[PDB]
Every structure is written in C-alpha cells, then in structure tokens.
Amino acid sequence: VVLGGDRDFWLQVGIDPIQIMTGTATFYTLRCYLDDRPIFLGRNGRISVFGSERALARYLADEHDHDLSDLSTYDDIRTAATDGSLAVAVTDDNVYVLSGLVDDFADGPDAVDREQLDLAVELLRDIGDYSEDSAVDKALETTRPLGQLVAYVLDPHSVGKPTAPYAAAVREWEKLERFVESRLRRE
C-alpha cells in the first residue's frame, strides 16, 4: 500500500538499498534486518548483486522466490517496480567500500581510513551472518593479525599499535575478500 513515489518509501518498507564498491565493480542490492538478523536480496546464503539501479529495478518487477519475497512489505516494492514508480536510492550510511583496503592494510593502520573500515566491517558481519558461515567472525578475532589490526584502527583510544610488516594481516584480508566475493551472486 506504500506507493513508489511516496516520500519515505524505503523507510516505510523497512528494506534498504545498499551500494557495495570494490576495486573492480560497484554493486546494488537490498538488505533488511528481521529479529536482529540481516536478510539480503538473495537465496541459499548468497546475495544477488546488480550493476545498476535500473538492473535491480528490472529484477524487482519480476515474480521471484528469494529470501525477501515473503516479507510483508515486499509486495510494495514489486508493485512500485511494475508501476514504474520505484526509485532506488541509497543513503550515505548504506555505502560500503572494500576498494583499496587490501593496499592500505599493507601500509599499516595509519594508511587505513577508520570510517571506511567501520562501514566495511558492518557489511562483512552482515554478510557472514546471512551466509551462516563463520569466516568473517573467525577472521576478525582479535588474536589474529587482521582482527588485531582492525580492532586497533576502529579504536582511537587504543595504544596497542601493530608493528610492521603487515603481510600476515594482508594475507588474511585477501582470504576474507575472496570469501565475500564468493557470496555475491552476479545476476
């Protein structure tokens, strides 16, 4: 019953369009939370990603059985898509950038942008939870080189600065980024 051109459409449907930027691609998808758990536009633990807002809108116009399609407001999205009124819009807090982190970790914590990393870890934890795979939780354990480095960057009151070289953290990040890529299903 929420029309596509309504002022607060995405807020009212309770589902967020998100943007994921990597060094080689920018993707769009949808994500929500149901009883404290992230659910993405996807199926079987893999997130459907789209190269443009138009491609996402085209997909949402079609009948689908995926992890969002039985949510009570999903029909509002599909009807907006078929009405031609769906306006996919990503708010600034739903912009997630993995690009460059692999290079920044190699130069140490001072090369890593804290805000970028904070947002990236938010997405990573959501992907790990949605995929029902422990890869993210394990990699970010603070015993490990990467988890220790991430915790340091995200805490401006920490004096436990990891010391060069950062090769171990880089290797662990590369493995984690491969995991993320394995969970993004190109539609």
Author numbering: 234 to 420
Show the paper's wording:
Here, we demonstrated that SatS, which we revealed is required for M. tuberculosis growth in macrophages, functions in the export of SapM and an additional subset of the proteins exported by the SecA2 pathway. We further identified properties of SatS that indicate a function as a protein export chaperone that protects its substrates from inappropriate interactions in the cytoplasm and additionally assists in their export. SatS is a highly acidic (pI 3.83), cytoplasmic protein with a role promoting export of a subset of the proteins exported by the SecA2 pathway. Finally, we determined the structure of the C-domain of SatS (SatSC), which reveals a new fold lacking similarities to any solved chaperone structures, yet contains surface hydrophobic grooves resembling those of the SecB chaperone.
Subsequently, constructs expressing SatSC or SatSN in E. coli were used to purify the individual domains to homogeneity for crystallization trials. Only SatSC yielded diffraction quality crystals diffracting to 1.4 Å resolution. SatSC displays α/β secondary structure comprised of a mostly parallel, four stranded β-sheet core, flanked by seven α-helices. The structure revealed a new fold sharing no similarities with any previously solved protein structure in the PDB based on DELTA-BLAST and VAST similarity searches. Although the overall polypeptide fold was not similar to known proteins, the surface of SatSC had pronounced electronegative charge potential that is comparable to many export chaperones, including SecB. Furthermore, the SatSC structure featured two surface localized hydrophobic grooves, mapped by the Kyte-Doolittle hydrophobicity scale. These grooves bore similarity to the hydrophobic grooves on SecB that serve as primary and secondary client binding sites to regions of unfolded preproteins. The proximity of the smaller hydrophobic groove in SatSC (Site 2) to the larger groove in SatSC (Site 1) as well as their amino acid composition (aromatic and bulky side chains) resembled the arrangement and composition of the client binding sites of SecB. The larger of the two hydrophobic grooves in SatSC (Site 1) was comparable in size to the ~60 Å long, main binding site in SecB. In fact, when we tested SatSC for chaperone activity in the in vitro anti-aggregation assay, SatSC alone was sufficient to ablate preSapM-HIS aggregation comparable to full length SatS.
